[model samples]
Target: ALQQLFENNVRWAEAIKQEDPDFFAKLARQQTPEYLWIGCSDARVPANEIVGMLPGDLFVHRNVANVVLHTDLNCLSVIQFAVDVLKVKHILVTGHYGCGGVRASLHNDQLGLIDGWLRSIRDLAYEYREHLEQLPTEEERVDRLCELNVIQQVANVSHTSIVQNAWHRGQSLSVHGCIYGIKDGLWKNLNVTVSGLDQLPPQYRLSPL
Candidate 1:
């Protein structure tokens, strides 16, 4: 199986080269992608390919339910690089509607060490318990929380020092929240986009000195 993957890789590379001989060479020289995707680790969601983007077109970082926490250095590191070094124009925090991680968090039963990682989602569910309980079914509640998780992660990313410092330094970065539907292969915007200090609530934005 692994050998077949390698063989497939060679075929893929050859296909790319056949289309554009200098494609890999140019990609090797430099990568200046315009967008940074913070998404779920689900095997079905292919960030770049979903948007019909080439390899060098989008930089990506993914994890369980696309959780973003201040203490998560792995996520922080990617955001820092994408903003400071890569200077990506947009940072998208995307979650899928039928996310397994979100589903696990919604359930009361423990699922081992991964539960620790899904703490934020669990807390979010607790916070919105009233709203979740209003939903028609467990499936609907899970899907709603999946959307809510993306919105929270987007806010969390915007709250990070990496994003704030970038805005302070006048970097053109915007944070957007989106949810992908596994059943339909569609993206739904939640109308949550934070572009700069002005867009944030007074409490969240840093004061001008």
Candidate 2:
């Protein structure tokens, strides 16, 4: 079943080589990507292709629904590396419309351990329950929640010590929240981009050392 994938990989590599003989060699040497993409694990949203970026051009960290929890060391570690190590200037928190995880979070269901993972989104929905209830349809509500989820994750990423420390050090880093419309094949910025400590509230901001 997977044999075709191997052949595809070989063909892809050959194509790239044909385009630029030194491509692999240079890509292997170093990856100084300027952007770190934190997006959903959905098959529809391929991080590089949607943004017209190549493999070595964008650093990626993906998970179910693209939720960023403060206690999620996996997500935090990615941010730390992107900010402290890779020195990525932009952190994109992208979610998509019609996300199963976001939709599931709206209802009560016994989905095993993933239930616990989706609890954070449930809490977010509850926080904005009034606004969500006013939406016209389920699809609209789900899409709005997806956008909100991306915005909240952007806040979570911005609140991380890793990002704060980088800002304190005068690093030019910005966290952006955006949503992808699967139907339209377009990404819409939620207009929530946090660039520095000044953009954050006093409670979430850290003092410079």
Candidate 3:
């Protein structure tokens, strides 16, 4: 399996280089990606391929359910680097329909380790129980939760100091909530894009120095 992957990597690189002789060399020099993708760890919803973006066009951080937690230093570090260093203009918090993580959150399964990680998603389900219960199907509930999770994560990313600091300093950045339909291979924006501090609640905004 590993040997096949290595061979595939060689073929992929050769294919790119065949089309553009200096592709890898130029890509190695700099990666000034304009978008930061915070997406699910699911194998189907590949960050770049779904968006038709190249490797050098997107900075990505993937987690189960595409979650963003204030205490997750790993995720925070990625955001800080993408925002402050890479200076990515857009952050896409993307989730997918029929997500295993989202489906698992709706159940009482005792999947260890991940259960702790998915606690917030369970809480999210509970918080939106009224609306979700009205949907009348497990699949619909899970899909709606997936969309809600993306919107919540988008807000979480926007509220982070890393992103807000960029806004305070007049950087052009936007955080968007997006969902993918795995069955149909299509992406849908949830229309919760945050472009500046003014778009956030006053309590979430920081006063510039």
Candidate 4:
């Protein structure tokens, strides 16, 4: 299975070589992807391939369960660059059904290093358990929680001080929530989109200093 991936890369390189012998050279110069995709680190779900794109098509970052923690500096750095420097038109937080991280959070299992990350999801689920329990079935409830998590993450990115601050300084940015099903090759929109710095609640917007 792994060898096939390498072979596929070779085939791709050979194909690109035909289009332009300078394909890699052009790519090496700079990246100008207009979209930012926040996704899960799950190997089964790949952003580029699933979205069907060539190199430099989309700027992306991924973590377990596709979380959007408000305080994670590393993640914020990527967003700042993608938004301010790259001027990415859209910010996308993509979650998936049957996510291992979500499953781990639902259970009492310890995955060592990853345990800390899952702890946050567990807390999110517990904090919103009442809302989750209102759903019909356990599966439905979990799925709802997962969708909520995705929305929260999207909001987290949009509510960043950088985004708000940038807006104050004059820039337009938008955040979107999305979910991709593992079995179905489809990108389902969450129908939650936010733009125009004023669109975000005052609490979500940056406060004056």
Give the alpha-carbon lDDT of every model. 0.91, 0.92, 0.93, 0.83
lDDT per residue, candidate 3, 8-46, as tens digits? Answer: 999999998899999989889987999999999999999
Q: Write the per-residue lDDT of candidate 4 for residues 1-209, one digit (tens) a residue.
A: 59999999999999999989999999989989878999999997899988897789889899889877777887888898998899888888899887888877877878998888777788888988788778787777667777878888887888888777767766767788999888787889998888767688876666744
Give the higher-lDDT candidate: 2 or 3.
3
Cα lDDT of model 2 by residue, 52-145, tens digit:
9987889999999998988989988999999999999999999999999999998888788889998889988999999999999999889889
lDDT of 2 at 52: 96
What is the number of backbone collisions in each predicted candidate, taken in the order shown?
Answer: 0, 0, 0, 0
Global lDDT for candidate 2? 0.92
Model 4: per-residue Cα lDDT at residue 108: 82
State in Å the error of residue 199, model 3.
1.1
Which portions of model 2 miss their true places by more than 4 Å? none
> Best to worst by TM-score, what's the order?
2, 3, 1, 4
* Full candidate order by lDDT, most accurate first: 3, 2, 1, 4
Flag the better candidate by lDDT, 3 or 4.
Answer: 3
Taking all chains together, the TM-score of candidate 1 against the true structure is: 0.96
Each model's TM-score? 0.96, 0.98, 0.97, 0.89
Clashing pairs in 2: none
